[PDB]
Amino acid sequence: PQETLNGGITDMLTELANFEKNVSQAIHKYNAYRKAASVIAKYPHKIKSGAEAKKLPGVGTKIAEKIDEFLATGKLRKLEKIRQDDTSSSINFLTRVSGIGPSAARKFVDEGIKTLEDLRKNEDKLNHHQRIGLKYFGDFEKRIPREEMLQMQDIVLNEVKKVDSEYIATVCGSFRRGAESSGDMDVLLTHPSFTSESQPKLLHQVVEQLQKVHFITDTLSKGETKFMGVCQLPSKNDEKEYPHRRIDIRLIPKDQYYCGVLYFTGSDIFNKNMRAHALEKGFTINEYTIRPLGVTGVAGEPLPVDSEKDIFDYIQWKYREPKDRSE
Template sequence: MSKRKAPKSEKNEDIVEALIELAEYEKNVERNRFKEKAYRKAATIIAGLDKRIKSGDDAKALPGVGDKIAKKIDEILETGKLRKLENIRADDKSTAINLLTRVSGIGPAKAKELVDAGIINLDDLEKHKDKLNHAQLIGLKHFHDFEVKIPREEVKELFESVKKVADSIDEEYMMEVCGSFRRGAKFSGDVDILLCHSEFKHSDKHHGDLLHRLIKKLTEKELVTDKISEGDTKFMGVAKLPKHKHFRRLDVRLLPVDEYYCGLLYFTGSNIFNTEMRAHAHQKRFILNEHSLRPLECGKPGAPLPVSSEQDIFEYLDYPYKKPEDRD
């Protein structure tokens, strides 16, 4: 997945970008996941507004916006900037950690380790490749390409190319692009494909070579250029279309056919929508996750319910159906 996905808002873009930057700081430097989640939730809610926020009090009427975030919004509205962010940007260590975590495969702990060793920029990383693992080396190799957002049409083209290869192997493959793309985003940070096969069910002990044979063929066709990791059910790597100049992050996840639609719902997102739907399921005495929908029986999850579409899940839960583009 892309490491930095900021929601967009034409009306409140300055506020949204500031909150996302604060979230990145809390995640990468302070390692405070609670504050990170709070900033991201507020940013997502504000990004969905179709009108300009006029004050912090105005923002506090929104879910996920408390006093502290409201005060920061007031400061942005009144001064056009945020003192806390200026202090963060002026701190060399914080800036270096935030930069290094943008390299795919480098998390906050590794970034701090590198900065503590005196490695503060990409040039330093190039000189100390011995400190990086395989995934991080690929992230460094393609850093500039991974920073470039993928236009929707290019995601479609890459997906269609992958699907064409899959169909040539076995027409029983089924797949779809998930994430923000499926929710209608104009640009994506990476391409996440959910894959299944009609003969692969949860009860099967072996996955066969369903994923491996697809990746093998994609590599032979030179669509896949680098492998970060490859297991029986998940591939992480790099892809490139012949007529395009940028290399792109590609993830392919294999699910059993009887888990496919719960997985499709979950991996489409958004995170806020998933949280709300799982909470609703619990109120209705169900357990919903990326694998299954189960009724709660005497406080314990029962057998998975048969699910043959996303709509089935909404109907079981008596939850109004929302199209993917309405799940932000």
């Protein structure tokens, strides 16, 4: 449905969502507000009353009232007030820095630190993730065009095969679904010598090579199975340098790779749909495995999976190209 159809309402609900997470520390009210924002933004009619919207799953009494006040006054008093609030609005803002959550932001604002400049003055009070978050605050809220993503995929698949040609890597996320832009790069990785019933060196060697050719520039976190960091395309000729980008690389056992690929390909709402279909079918799907329920409710052993399609077959669903997995 069109943007400014009920855009005024969904912006209201998303604002309310973020204050719940970042200021009130009420994570379930956060998800609640977003569930309503989502179900309304897909509703193909301009909403006339709070009662009209209350018919949608996720829209209860309190949001129905808020919609009324909005439709009648063009604003929400509680939201207007909380926007005015110097403490609460500063807390909400600081959480836009990756590494700073609802709790850290609460602390900074307590001891007087409210803005980016305040963060820049106080580097010694920040940890490694947060410094990188501050350093790339602007870049991180930018989107990545598919053309850049393709160029990034080139570098990654190249350097990975160059380390060891038996590696298997797949760029998942929205990129794999064909999207015209992406928020980050989600890379999945496996090797024929790494399974469930089974070398930690496998992930480290890939990160290292990518740092060598200077594709990876910073590191947020890194273990034996998951890498979170920053990456940048090399800049061409004398043209303006590319934004720094968020990139994830995680090493998955060969056994669990395609449950991994399928899950991390998304979309979000496709996953929950395909998890519940799926449920009436007597199977249970997580990111690792698919297991059979289970005549009382016991899970049997993990079932063998050697492609995405296998998992589609178990639950008797027609395989669907990542292109169509928007839900």
